[PDB]
Amino acid sequence: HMLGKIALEEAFALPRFEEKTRWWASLFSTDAETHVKEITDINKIRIEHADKHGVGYQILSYTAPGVQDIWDPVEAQALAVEINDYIAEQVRVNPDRFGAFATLSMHNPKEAADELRRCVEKYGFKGALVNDTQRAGPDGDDMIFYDNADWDIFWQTCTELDVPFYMHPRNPTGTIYEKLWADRKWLVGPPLSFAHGVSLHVLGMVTNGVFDRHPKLQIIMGHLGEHVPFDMWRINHWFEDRKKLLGLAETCKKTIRDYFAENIWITTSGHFSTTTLNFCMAEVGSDRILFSIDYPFETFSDACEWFDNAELNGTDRLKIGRENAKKLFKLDSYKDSSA
Amino acid sequence: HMLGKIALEEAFALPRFEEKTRWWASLFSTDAETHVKEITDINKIRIEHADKHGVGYQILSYTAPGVQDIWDPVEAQALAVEINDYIAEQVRVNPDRFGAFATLSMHNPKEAADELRRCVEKYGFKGALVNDTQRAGPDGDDMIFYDNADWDIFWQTCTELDVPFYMHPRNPTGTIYEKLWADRKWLVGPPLSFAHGVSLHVLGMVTNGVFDRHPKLQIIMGHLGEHVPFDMWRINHWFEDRKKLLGLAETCKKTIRDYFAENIWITTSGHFSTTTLNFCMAEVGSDRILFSIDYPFETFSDACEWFDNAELNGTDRLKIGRENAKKLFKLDSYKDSSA
Amino acid sequence: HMLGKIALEEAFALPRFEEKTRWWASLFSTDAETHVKEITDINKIRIEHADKHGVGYQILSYTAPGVQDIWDPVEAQALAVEINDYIAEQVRVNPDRFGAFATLSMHNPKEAADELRRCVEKYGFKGALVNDTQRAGPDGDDMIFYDNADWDIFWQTCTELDVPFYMHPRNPTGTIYEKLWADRKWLVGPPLSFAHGVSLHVLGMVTNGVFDRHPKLQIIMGHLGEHVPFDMWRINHWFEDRKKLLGLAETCKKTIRDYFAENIWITTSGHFSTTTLNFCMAEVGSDRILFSIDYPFETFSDACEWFDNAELNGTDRLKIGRENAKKLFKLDSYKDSSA
Amino acid sequence: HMLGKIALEEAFALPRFEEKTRWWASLFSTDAETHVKEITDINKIRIEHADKHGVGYQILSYTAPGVQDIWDPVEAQALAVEINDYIAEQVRVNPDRFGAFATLSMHNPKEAADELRRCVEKYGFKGALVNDTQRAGPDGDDMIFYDNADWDIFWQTCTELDVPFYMHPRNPTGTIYEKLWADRKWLVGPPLSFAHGVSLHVLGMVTNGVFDRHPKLQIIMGHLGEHVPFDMWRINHWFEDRKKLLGLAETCKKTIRDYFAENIWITTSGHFSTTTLNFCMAEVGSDRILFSIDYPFETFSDACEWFDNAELNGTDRLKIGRENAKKLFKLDSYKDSSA
Ligand SMILES: [Mg+2]
Ligand SMILES: [Mg+2]
Ligand SMILES: [Mg+2]
Ligand SMILES: [Mg+2]
Ligand SMILES: [Mg+2]
Ligand SMILES: [Mg+2]
């Protein structure tokens, strides 16, 4: 029904990574051959789906774990550059249907900032999408988080370009995988592990002052906010009435509710629940919620049939379906953008 | 207003552990001296609070991390026995106001089963409360989870005695603490880390078949279910429409919704939110929700003023406030139990 | 999808009233020919629909306005008797799938009490369904309400037999129709007028003490309670904090919430909204909510595809879909009643 | 706690009408002496309350039933003019804290249009507030509704001036009162009758095409929309899937949801329920909801302690508390308007 929807947690993979794509599909797809075709296609199948389901514009991003899985920094950087150059060429075929987020190696703040800048200035990319922490160390068992002073140069590039950063999940790896997940491996990914990573990282940015140093910064979480809205009351209470009397206020100057009003966005990717959406409208506000699909891990049909037919007031259907994202991403037109 | 409420996430500590109690208070209390007094008191201050706030009956349990912090199995077992003997003596002073959960060393299934049995048969304890995984290994850096075949003898003791098991959180420790939490330490405890542990463990029990082998088993989570209700739609979708087509069905025979209807309970401890309660009533059902406080980490006043004054239908106020727990714990009377 | 559902706002009309059936259908059906066939059929089409949509048992009642439109008391009573004798014979064809509510002339309390008793004792009817006030007076411009002492003999018959009374709507007529509805006639029926009538009458029963004199009496409203749950807070406030200090307490001894917990039920007829259902769960409680369809004004498909696919915890899906009604109507087994 | 809130269902009475004030207070106040003082005071007590409770600006309007109770058109028009002249002088004492809605005789469209224009152009009033239908006829038993072509000249004046019209309730009178309310009189006012009147009139405006002929017109309902949001699903279904196929489309060209997105607003007057507010956020959207109090029928303390402490995201707290009304009424600065 609604046309001109915007989706922005929508993944692609390079054709040359077929073995890696099949491994990820073995965990998260029930049809590996269709998955390979869909995750690598840009301008045919994806357009056909979008045309059937009222999706005017998609901001595309690299599949997880993507560059965040690559612990050799030279290899990781070369891969990010390769991906960005590739997708820029592909989305030129349909500029009224596609934009792109930058894919980044996050081993080094300045390097990541320069590549984001190249993507925005040269190609008109819409922001960055990164799959949680950067794998690092000689065998990839370490993790680089971005919630510290090293990353100020990077966050300032985001605010200067005035583009958002999407904190996407990745799988647990190395010792964390072995200690917590291997004996309950069916919880890896959407059932639990993904949200544990993203919520940790974003709440780390909150409590380490990233949004105080960079109050213009916009961070996006998928999956209706990776559990955080469920605990908005509890986090707020344990911040304002507990931890902020014990030292948290030194590095965290606003409430969790303020950060969701001013800095944080959530999307509907992979979480096609009107009951949960309504609860998020209460705890986060419809102005801060964006439609998204999570293709090809989720189908256009599941996401769009859900959203198009959900019981919702017309004002919020318009905002969540497209108008919030239109404003955030400064889109002056695209296919069906005012339908 | 409502009298005869039951609370059952209510902690005590042994007087001899004053230094340890002060350390935990330094993280989670804004008034260490009052905290020490309240966590060690059983029969004076706690009764005064309950009398003011309409709490008829409290099931008491040992503070976290408690015995789960003790990696020497001989020491841990001796401590559990000591705690159970102690609290049995203390609650004899007010048997119409207090019951107790067993405190257990969870290093060994048979040992834990025998001590639970002793507590139930000798002292009339109401179940077990355990602070997530058992610390183990020479320096306590390993973790023992209970979602595997070793623990069948223990879960069968729970179902034979027909008493529930409360999966309470504990703090992250060792390598997990260093890798994930030390650089964002204000998230330790109620803001995030606690729920990550409990949800992992309980969803591990689900996906490893514990509730299929032990369909009578009742597991309780605090804090409105440690995020799980927020993702009921998403977990259910990623189980029934994804992982159960890839191998999960071999060890997981019912839906996540079935397990919440048949095996899992949530309490309101530390989560005094009518908006979130309403959402949990939708996703879990009021029949499966129990009032609780989380004293002395939370105050009676905060929990009871919230619940007593929350907008709620009378049927569910009665059930959540006491009648659900009255039935689950087979309470035929206690102070104000039918007021 | 759930089997063995119970629906109980399910209408029929006598074959000899085709003209009246067509007049009503001209207001409320988009396919009059199908409507005529469906509202008169009992044992064929209704079973075809119920078999496709998981409805095990239907409690049938007479179409609105039915006997309540008949202001001649002799004609009205004869019609009620005729209808009850008719439907008792029809349900005997397939008693495993159908029960019936009594149809009554409500001109005279004793007369209506005697006919309800005959229906329960002779035919095993499940209660009464009445279309709001009884038209009366020489030209049918008066209306008989049941919220006064003259009706005590009738309400005592309901409680003695221990069967519920379903307060169904009827159209506005006479002077009320001309003054309020004729100039906005598209609001007649489900859009507004029906709920105005039923809510007035039931809240009349509340404020005139019917449920105080007859505390066992069970009253059922369709359409998720005819707006009343929306104003549960506002009614409760304007009773307990206002009118109960000005004289209402003389004739109304409990709160509106008490009456919903003890006396009043709501059904899902004609209101296939999960968002509104959730809100009713909060304001009324799932123990007091019954599935129903409103056939043939609504389709089995709309009601059952909604309910069967609604996001809902399994506990409440079972209660609302059948278990609440199984208990309330003391039902023997019926098709799929324990599926 | 939020400062600079705007309230706009805030009543006053003329000092010379003490007897009428006391009669109304005998129905709707538990402290008549305080009520008399509060409803007549403008500039002292109202400011004391607003200063304590974070209310920066109050748009005042005339008490119900007000001019709508006056069936002599000459007396009614003279009274409306008197009231507007009176309140314009009162608000000039403290214009930073107060504005006013026009009080109108609604016997004649052109007359009411001319008086609304005088109030806006001469006094800077913010719109009109009218207590439902105008009593009329020789004995006041008739009622004038505004949902027809005779009122086009009036609705065009509202859109030309670009000011809203607040449809406030009044009591039932005359034949309607005797037939429906006299025997259940405790339902008169906030418990039920008020909402029945307003919802009828506004849904009359919908179904008679007022918002099609006047698409810019803004209509406001108090009391969270006078039940209408509860039936948003049911009305929409019975319009789009039923009545719109039977003739309603001839006079009603959009959906009920479209009219709530484009034309209709709701306020929180007298309905201090977060659960119901959340439901209205879903069904109507926070962009269309305005804080209000209903003083002096409700207290500042009840309304403001509720709203200031309600669990709500910060985006919507700001919009509902003041920013929606600041935009709708084109407000200059007032006390704490940007606090
Ligand atoms: Mg190949
Ligand atoms: Mg994704
Ligand atoms: Mg000491
Ligand atoms: Mg605790
Ligand atoms: Mg019906
Ligand atoms: Mg008012």
Numbering used by the authors:
A (entry chain B), B (entry chain B), C (entry chain A), D (entry chain A): 0 to 338
The authors write:
The divalent metal‐dependent enzymes are capable of catalyzing the reversible non‐oxidative (de)carboxylation of a variety of electron‐rich (hetero)aromatic substrates analogously to the chemical Kolbe‐Schmitt reaction. All of the metal‐dependent decarboxylases identified so far are members of the amidohydrolase superfamily, which share significant structural and mechanistic similarities, such as a (β/α)8‐barrel fold harboring one catalytically essential divalent metal ion in the active site. The mechanism follows an electrophilic aromatic substitution in analogy to the Kolbe‐Schmitt reaction: First, a divalent metal ion chelates the carboxylate and phenol group in the o‐position, which facilitates protonation at the ipso‐carboxylate position by a highly conserved Asp residue, thereby breaking aromaticity as the rate‐determining step. Subsequent cleavage of the C−C bond yields CO2 and phenol as products.
